[PDB]
């Protein structure tokens, strides 16, 4: 079951990945890819609170994936993101592909 | 009319038609120099604006007198008319398509304005030009000290500003008030009316946003310029390309 | 004293008067020059500031070289005296009536600096120019590295910083570092003596906005175009311009 | 490579070597360029980066219209490309040394915005000058039409723009869109390698904050301009002037 | 036309339950099952500020659907639920599912 | 690539807009339709604080739609909204009949 | 046409001096005196965030007048005002006065 | 009894108009002229809180009038506007020009 | 010398208070008028925190006179007022008809 | 003249910053070194606001030292901190021991 | 190693003090003196939440002082302190009389 | 006993004045030089709401010095200052430099 999910809003990310979380403990091999832009893309800085949850994520075979627009509107460095982060030239045309190629779209 | 404009296609002549008062502008004129933009600007075969004389000789003696002097203690009169040229000073300096000012004579005060709101001007040998409120205790609008000091600097500006002093054609090729020197404006016309028009009118408008301040590319004027390889101009310039002909824009 | 102000009615001479050194700048120079740009204006009759040697030749060679070596390692008059060149060359920039430099011979770093400053500049045959820090590993203030390149743009004035070379009088006219070829400023300031200081002074602000990254007219500049129509000088304008007679300003 | 670095001392030449395509640009060029002046940058003895042919010739035609056709249809390039012409631009016109492009044929297009972000440019009798992005309806990047529009102004960047049409060596002289004529760089590099690099680096970074827009010097350009007294070049320039030597930086 | 629609916001449940409406309205004999998780599951709730907005959708034979994850860790019982409401092991689980089912997805 | 995006939260347009110029720029003549709805509607309104935004994606022939149901709710005259753009029945309506027709979507 | 104007409440002054600014622009020959008392005195100290308009306000004319009760009552000394100020003894008995000599009155 | 009103902070439009309501059924044919400027010309707008009122005055003869430049400020358009409001090109302007013609002013 | 004093901003009654003391002070036989409306009605509550300030203007045969609009609107009771205050049917209409009768008048 | 300049506040970095200029600026050939601990350690990351005033003041020549526990406290990696920075075990132990040496102490 | 510690401001307590213990950890043999006035002599107090800190400090030999001008200022007592405290008639004469001893200053 | 004094926040001033006065009183003899800058520059003006006290400062032969780089940036003319206030180019400057002259340094 190939699932692109999408994460937007910083304030948010808790309980997004937390509902990933669930998705992937309900969903029997899961295929997940966690596409985060705009201002959720923070979450992905190496002193982010959430980092423990989206290694957590990566131990689970789940694929992390940062907007490079929003990396650039955020002002921040590859340098201060979560090692093992995949970057795409832009979070949404990355759903939209996913989804084109039969992913699931799941908003969060 | 004193001011009209006439349409010929690709091509569009503002002109100037007032010989017995060296074109000398009106609050009339003024007014009705935006109406005729937007005429003008409505006609999507339009590629060039030409802004000349009907008659050659003077371009324009800039004020009135005769109205000025019947006005000058009339401040509703001098509220209007104030209002009036700073509209058409903006509408003609923003008018969508490549713009020339063909100068063969006298380009005075309110006259060189319009000279310096379009985007080039050709100089004849008998062009002369001056701006000259300092001779009657007058301003310049700090819109066309603006599109001034864009062309020549501060020190040219306020060369011809303070003396109100007149220049000769070679004189203001020098010091880069005209771009050209000439008899005629139908080369050049030639020549603008060829390219496309997406593409002078969005390189227009980044000029513009390089003179009101913007130093760096952003997002929107990355996006501007990507937009053109979706467009049927550059489907038409590469498919003559392919085929050794010139493109029809 | 070695730099001293001359008020002769409507112009003022602001005299550089040190042959020996070749007009070269000391510090006390530099700090006086403020004082005497203050005299000058406080004089209601006061129509235009020349800028030029007392004695011909050499306009300004820059810093005095006896002074530089002497102080190398005293870092209190480095920061005296970069104090008081900044504040120099801001009132000179600022100077609320038109200012002339003219130049009929060296005029090196400080001095170039100085010329740059004023609204425009002549330069007589022997003219020269040239901005030297590159040659002693120092640095030119900002305030006039935007000063040269709101002048000859960025290429030319890279040319002359970067370098330290020194440039005649017809290659700073072709550059437009300086704005007229000639013997004298009497003519020039004949016809700046004779125009509105109303319009001069207003002009020049307007033009400094401009420069200071203003693109368009606000609310304010379009009170003071206004208040144009409302003063002394444009009621003597069109009262002259009736009886066919130049205005007296 | 059809891209490369020399590094020769004092001097760094980026070499455009292919003369089968009259010089010009692929994709992986452009790519390629900001890592040549990487190399370039960490070299601590390099004082001036010259850009110029390797086979003399045609400086740049611009796009390889091969490469430009065969992708007509291919978003990804365009984005791709759009983006590496960009960067490739921003750094050249922001490397910390004094460049100098020497033009000594056709200089058309992105060849024409490889030119215009060197500090100054040299042009040999057979140079020729163009922008053409309008006659395939195309736009040009709002940092190039900044750099045009900062030497020529905004009419004579009109007149290139609009009509694509190429000028000579002379007519790009004449405007200011080249600073300087003649058939080598060499007497210009051999300037440029003796001055102080403390000098022409931080001079370079007050004329581009002018650029930018700074119009008054501030806490930090006051700083700069007093480090340079505490500076090792200062104190050879000052030691080589008392010995009556010229200065080694 | 069948819709899967999620609501996963309790600040934003009122305009997702008016956005419902305004869906039902619109497209005709549409086939809806609304799934709330994360906080909206409040909104379930027998005290419930929207619970006549919600009884009006099950009257209009809307399928309201509550994640059984959420209740938990928002602390609440089934008992204190609207009755008549459906509950589902995941939230997130259910939104994919039925998308690859063929259901249209809205997030609300 | 046709694809139908939505936008809902009025507080987080300037960021979605971002998003839409991003979804532009990385595909290759993306065909997209904005849909806004709830309170997102008022970034439509001849005074918003995004106007030159939305006019620069109608110029990049991106197809701006308001809800008219959210027009009602939040008391706007369709003589206050930005010329140019065109309005649906049902913000949620038009959504999901976009994706039924074959457009990706996206929610933002 | 003589007119005096009053301005009272600090937090409102920088739209007074635009509406001055409007009034010079609109009415000819325009003979104006502004009045400042209450917490708008604080409007004229020479730190003041609005000095640079009320200097171009006197550069056009127009003459500046503030309150010596209100000046009092609110700490400040002459010393502490922009230069070129005048001081009337009470705002509200110039204002008052100027009204009986034939100005017109505009409360701002 | 000609009175000319003036109204300038938009938080103060509710009670102002309820002012100029009171002044109506106080002064018998009182003719009134009320010019909104400033902030207050957005009360002016179709969409406005205060427009129903607005529109009761309008019934009772009384002249609405917005002020031009105030409308060019708040970056509004007259197809923005209720319809049947007039417009000045200065409020201020218009304020002092009635006086002098003898109308009674009255700030609220 | 007649004047007619208008106070309508409850939180600006102190500063208007001392403002009639200045123009007392200041203009030798004044005879003033002040009229309170809107939420400044508010002050001539016998609890009001500016009593002992009104009741001193009386003491310096000040009158003060209270909007009965106001009153209404405000849902206070005669009983509640202050004392030896005077009451009109409307404070804007004593306003413009005292300066009909030569009153000149002072916002404050 | 050596100076060991203290930054423990993040919220007044800038203005701190904007003091080693002046500091700089006004002693000439003065030795600099300044150390960040505490909150203000953050100041230090690359994709901190301050970045660019960070980087002039190492052109300057100016010494910028973090400390080792403050990065630790505020979980932030090496990896995200500006290029050139050196790091010290202790901040306070470096301010004291600087002291030690000679350096004069300067905390903003 | 001589340190004489200030501390001033109470909100800042809790960091002060973990850089008094980094200060211990970091500088072997370290003969501290910590001076609490101001508001931070609250810090002192036994029912202060930084106690057991305080009392860890005293363990590892620290002196803690505490000021009595800011004892009284405080309204304290001394019996409301935590025991083994010293207390100086100033603390800033204190600090500054360590200064001149010898000590390097700290201001936490 | 020669001491340098600091303050720099101006929301502090109040404290840091009554902690000089502490110092006076405490130490015999005691010759202080206070220096103000950044925003505690404010405190030296003629109307400034601690005037009395650095008046009281002044009497007791304290010098009380301000920054003229700070003046500079807060706008302020020298015309506005407490009169027999020394200043100095820079703050910062002069408190390391007295700091090299033997005055033990005290930051309040």
Chains 1, 5, 6, 7, 8, 9, 10, 11, 12 share one sequence.
């Not at chain 1, 957590?56 to 201060?80: M, P, W």
Request: proline letters at 3%; one cysteine or more; hydrophobic letters at 45%.
């Amino acid at each position: 079951m190939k699932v692109v999910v999408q994460i937007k809003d910083f304030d948010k990310v808790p309980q997004a990945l937390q509902s990933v979380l669930n998705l992937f403990l309900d969903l029997g091999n899961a295929e997940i890819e966690v596409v985060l832009h705009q201002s959720a893309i923070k979450a992905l800085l190496l002193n982010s609170p959430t980092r423990s949850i989206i290694e957590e994520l990566i131990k689970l075979n789940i694929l992390i994936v940062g907007c490079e627009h929003s990396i650039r509107s955020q002002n921040l460095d590859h340098r201060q993101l979560i090692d093992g982060i995949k970057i795409v030239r832009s979070g949404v045309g990355e759903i939209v592909r996913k989804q084109s190629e039969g992913w699931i779209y799941l908003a969060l | 009319m004193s001011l009209r404009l006439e349409r010929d296609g690709a091509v569009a002549r503002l002109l100037i038609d007032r010989a017995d008062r060296r074109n000398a502008f009106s609050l009339d004129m003024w007014q009705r120099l935006p109406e005729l933009l937007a005429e003008a600007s409505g006609d999507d075969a339009l590629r060039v604006l030409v802004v000349k004389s009907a008659n050659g000789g003077a371009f324009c003696a800039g004020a009135d007198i005769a109205e000025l002097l019947a006005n000058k203690d009339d401040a509703a009169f001098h509220l209007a008319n104030q209002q009036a040229i700073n509209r058409a000073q903006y509408e003609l300096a923003r008018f969508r398509l490549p713009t020339v000012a063909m100068v063969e004579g006298d380009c005075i005060g309110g006259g060189c304005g319009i000279a310096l709101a379009c985007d080039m001007r050709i100089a004849a040998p008998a062009a002369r030009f001056g701006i000259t409120p300092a001779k009657l205790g007058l301003v310049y609008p700090l819109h066309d000290v603006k599109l001034l000091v864009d062309l020549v600097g501060p020190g040219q500006a306020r060369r011809l500003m303070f003396t109100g002093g007149l220049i000769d054609a070679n004189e203001a090729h020098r010091i880069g008030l005209v771009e050209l020197l000439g008899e005629s404006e139908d080369a050049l016309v030639g020549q603008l009316a060829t390219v496309s028009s997406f593409s002078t009118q969005a390189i227009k408008s980044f000029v513009r946003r390089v003179l009101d301040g913007q130093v760096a590319d952003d997002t929107l004027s990355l996006c501007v310029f990507a937009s053109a390889t979706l467009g049927a101009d550059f489907r038409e310039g590469t498919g003559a390309f392919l085929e050794k002909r010139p493109p029809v824009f």
